[PDB]
Structures are given as structure tokens and as C-alpha cells.
């Protein structure tokens, strides 16, 4: 038995913490929806 609960609005925040890099990766997508590096 699964159920959903509201978590908030879908809005861009004018003061969000910026983090994470921007890696460019060659990947492949198989029939089962799995990504894998090349």
C-alpha cells in the first residue's frame, strides 16, 4: 500500500545553495533503463 503526501510548491528559489560539478560522460542506456559508462 503506497500513498503520496504534499511536499511543497514547484518554484525556483531566489536563494538556493549551489553545489555539484558538471561532468561530461559517455554513457549507454540499455533496454532495462540502466545507464552505464563507456
Amino acid at each position: 500500500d503506497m500513498y503520496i503526501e504534499r511536499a511543497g510548491d514547484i518554484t525556483w528559489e531566489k536563494d538556493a545553495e549551489v553545489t555539484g560539478n558538471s561532468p561530461r560522460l559517455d554513457v549507454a542506456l540499455d533496454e532495462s533503463g540502466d545507464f552505464s559508462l563507456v
Binding site: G8, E31, G33
Partner: protein
């Protein structure tokens, strides 16, 4: 029982207790999440039931009550925001510049953000508040961290 718009946690009533398995987006009367979150199982919205409408395992997407409504995409240049809804924590916008999944069929945006496996399905937003994809399907890179594709469906 509810069709309002916003971001939602996807919870389960398992063995003993509740547990957040994923996150979703309700928009235009349709609930959008990732397939590995619900596995095509119906969801409960209070007293009303949400029945799967469309799903694709390769896309890793599922929509309830109607067709996929999210059609925005990353512009390849600007920063985006991950509207992460982790288990037990309030929804938070995490701004980032996406990387690139260079595939056989083209480039796909990817956010190098690592969050609990109950954040799966969290929307990724552009500067205009549009959902350009969902968070939760990606790769673990050569060092051990996680990189999620910006998984979007077709409208």
C-alpha cells in the same frame, strides 16, 4: 481525492511503519514519478486512488491519471535547481549547472548530486519553474559519487 499541483513524497505502508520510497510531481491532474519508485503500482491520494496511465521502463517513467504532462527540457547552458524532497527533511532547492550524458542518440543533462534513495523522482527545475526532468536514474562515476540523468518523458 486530490489533484492539486505541487511536489509530493511517495510513501509506503510496509511491514511496520511508513517509509518514503520516492518523490513525484502532480501537474495538470497527472502524477509523475519514476518507474523504479512505484513499479507501476497504484497509489493512494487520501480516499481516492491513482491508477497508472502510461509507463516506460527504459525511460524509467510512470504517469498516473493521465498522459505525461511535463515537456520542458534543459537549455544546455543555464543552471537548474533540484527540488529535492529527502525523507524526513523539508523540500529544498539545490541549484547546480548540469553536466552532459553523451549518448549514442544525443546529449542529456545530468546533475552531479547525491541524495537519499527516497529523493528519487524529485523534479529538476529551470529558471521559469518548469520541470525539465526527474532525479533518480543515472551512474556512479569512477570515484564513487552519483550522477543522475535529467530524465524527461514525451508529451
Amino acid at each position: 481525492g486530490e489533484t492539486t499541483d505541487g511536489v509530493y513524497r511517495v510513501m509506503t505502508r510496509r511491514l511496520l511503519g511508513s517509509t518514503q520510497v520516492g518523490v513525484g510531481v502532480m501537474q495538470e491532474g497527472v502524477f509523475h514519478t519514476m518507474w523504479h519508485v512505484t513499479k507501476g503500482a497504484a497509489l493512494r491520494s487520501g480516499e481516492g486512488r491513482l491508477d497508472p496511465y502510461w509507463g516506460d521502463v527504459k525511460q524509467d517513467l510512470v504517469s498516473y491519471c493521465g498522459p505525461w504532462k511535463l515537456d520542458a527540457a534543459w537549455d544546455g547552458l543555464s543552471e537548474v535547481q533540484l527540488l529535492a524532497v529527502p525523507p524526513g527533511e523539508r523540500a529544498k532547492n539545490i541549484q547546480t549547472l548540469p553536466g552532459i550524458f553523451k549518448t549514442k542518440d544525443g546529449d542529456i543533462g545530468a546533475v552531479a548530486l547525491d541524495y537519499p534513495a527516497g529523493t528519487s523522482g524529485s523534479p529538476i527545475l529551470d529558471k521559469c519553474g518548469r520541470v525539465i526532468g526527474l532525479y533518480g536514474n543515472g551512474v556512479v562515476i569512477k570515484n564513487g559519487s552519483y550522477v543522475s540523468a535529467i530524465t524527461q518523458g514525451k508529451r
